[PDB]
Each structure stands twice: as C-alpha cells, then as structure tokens.
Design an enzyme around this catalytic site. Structure first.
Site, mmCIF file in Angstrom:
data_model
loop_
_atom_site.group_PDB
_atom_site.id
_atom_site.type_symbol
_atom_site.label_atom_id
_atom_site.label_comp_id
_atom_site.label_asym_id
_atom_site.label_seq_id
_atom_site.Cartn_x
_atom_site.Cartn_y
_atom_site.Cartn_z
ATOM 1 N N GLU A 35 39.604 48.063 34.962
ATOM 2 C CA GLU A 35 40.517 46.941 35.272
ATOM 3 C C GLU A 35 41.882 47.286 34.677
ATOM 4 O O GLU A 35 42.863 47.287 35.452
ATOM 5 C CB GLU A 35 39.963 45.613 34.757
ATOM 6 C CG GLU A 35 38.746 45.115 35.523
ATOM 7 C CD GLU A 35 38.922 44.942 37.027
ATOM 8 O OE1 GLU A 35 40.086 44.952 37.518
ATOM 9 O OE2 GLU A 35 37.885 44.808 37.720
ATOM 10 N N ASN A 46 49.778 41.488 43.233
ATOM 11 C CA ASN A 46 48.834 41.633 44.367
ATOM 12 C C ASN A 46 49.665 41.706 45.648
ATOM 13 O O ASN A 46 50.923 41.722 45.543
ATOM 14 C CB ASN A 46 47.794 40.510 44.395
ATOM 15 C CG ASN A 46 46.775 40.630 43.278
ATOM 16 O OD1 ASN A 46 47.114 41.023 42.159
ATOM 17 N ND2 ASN A 46 45.521 40.309 43.577
ATOM 18 N N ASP A 48 49.198 39.385 47.942
ATOM 19 C CA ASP A 48 49.289 37.924 48.224
ATOM 20 C C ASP A 48 50.057 37.217 47.104
ATOM 21 O O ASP A 48 49.630 36.127 46.683
ATOM 22 C CB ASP A 48 47.894 37.307 48.367
ATOM 23 C CG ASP A 48 47.094 37.321 47.082
ATOM 24 O OD1 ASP A 48 46.592 38.406 46.722
ATOM 25 O OD2 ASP A 48 47.024 36.256 46.437
ATOM 26 N N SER A 50 50.210 36.526 44.010
ATOM 27 C CA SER A 50 49.484 36.342 42.718
ATOM 28 C C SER A 50 49.425 37.659 41.925
ATOM 29 O O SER A 50 49.545 38.738 42.521
ATOM 30 C CB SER A 50 48.101 35.724 42.919
ATOM 31 O OG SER A 50 47.226 36.554 43.669
ATOM 32 N N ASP A 52 47.578 39.924 38.479
ATOM 33 C CA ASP A 52 46.363 40.142 37.645
ATOM 34 C C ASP A 52 46.771 40.236 36.171
ATOM 35 O O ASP A 52 47.740 40.985 35.869
ATOM 36 C CB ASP A 52 45.566 41.368 38.099
ATOM 37 C CG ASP A 52 44.681 41.112 39.308
ATOM 38 O OD1 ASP A 52 44.559 39.931 39.708
ATOM 39 O OD2 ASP A 52 44.113 42.099 39.840
#
Length: 129
Positions: A35, A46, A48, A50, A52
């Site tokens: 990750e 991202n 879209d 958003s 992480d």
C-alpha cells in the site's frame, strides 16, 4: 515514520489485527508493504478525485474527510490528516470497520492483487512477537 517489518507487526498485533475477522497479522503487514512501503506519510490521488491516506491507503471517498472530495462520507469519522501520523490507532480502528464491510481484506487492491494466494506469514517471519 517509515515503520519496520516487525515493529509495525508488533504495532498492529498490540492493536488486535492478528486474526481480525480471521486475517492473520501476515495479511496486514503484506498489504501495508505494498500500500505505502510502511510509510505513515504516504499520500496518493485517484482517477476519481479522492485521495489514498497513509499506511493502509484508506480512501477519502468512503472513509476520511480531506475537504476536497465532493460526493464523500467519512463513516470512520476522522480527518484524513490523522491517518498520516506516526500513530496507527486511527489507521487500524478505521481498517477494522472496512475489513467488516462483508468484503474481507479485498477492499484493499494491493493485497488481493499481491498478497492473497501467497505465504503471508513470511512477512512477519523471524520477528520477535
């Protein structure tokens, strides 16, 4: 803070991740490796909008509020800014609620794509716990 292999393990174990909804500590450490390379400061946009957030690459879209994701909810009820700290408490407790969305640990892509269907226990192997 760039965590160890074993001190994030001992860190996530002490927070009750080992066999949480039945995923061994070896699942979490494996995920955590791919990750964010064990990085609490890791931040990723991202496609879209958003973004992480931190160790477990938790999604602003569905989980934390970051002030610039229009169609969002923060059901974890935390500013994303928390999931970036040397502290993993907000990153773990939020993860307990995600892993419990009748999805298991598949919610995270870099685990069902790099971790699931491999000897995950190698990832916490030879560590003192």
């Amino acid at each position: 803070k760039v965590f160890g292999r074993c001190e994030l393990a001992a860190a996530m174990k002490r927070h009750g991740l080992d066999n949480y909804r039945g995923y061994s500590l070896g699942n979490w450490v494996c995920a955590a490796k791919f990750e964010s390379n064990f990085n609490t400061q890791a931040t990723n946009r991202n496609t879209d909008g958003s973004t992480d957030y931190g160790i477990l690459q938790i999604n602003s879209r569905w989980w934390c509020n970051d002030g610039r994701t229009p169609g969002s909810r923060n059901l974890c009820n935390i500013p994303c800014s928390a999931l970036l700290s040397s502290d993993i408490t907000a990153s773990v407790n939020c993860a307990k609620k995600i892993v419990s969305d009748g999805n298991g640990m598949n919610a995270w892509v870099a685990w069902r794509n790099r971790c699931k269907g491999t000897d995950v226990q190698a990832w916490i192997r030879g560590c003192r716990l």
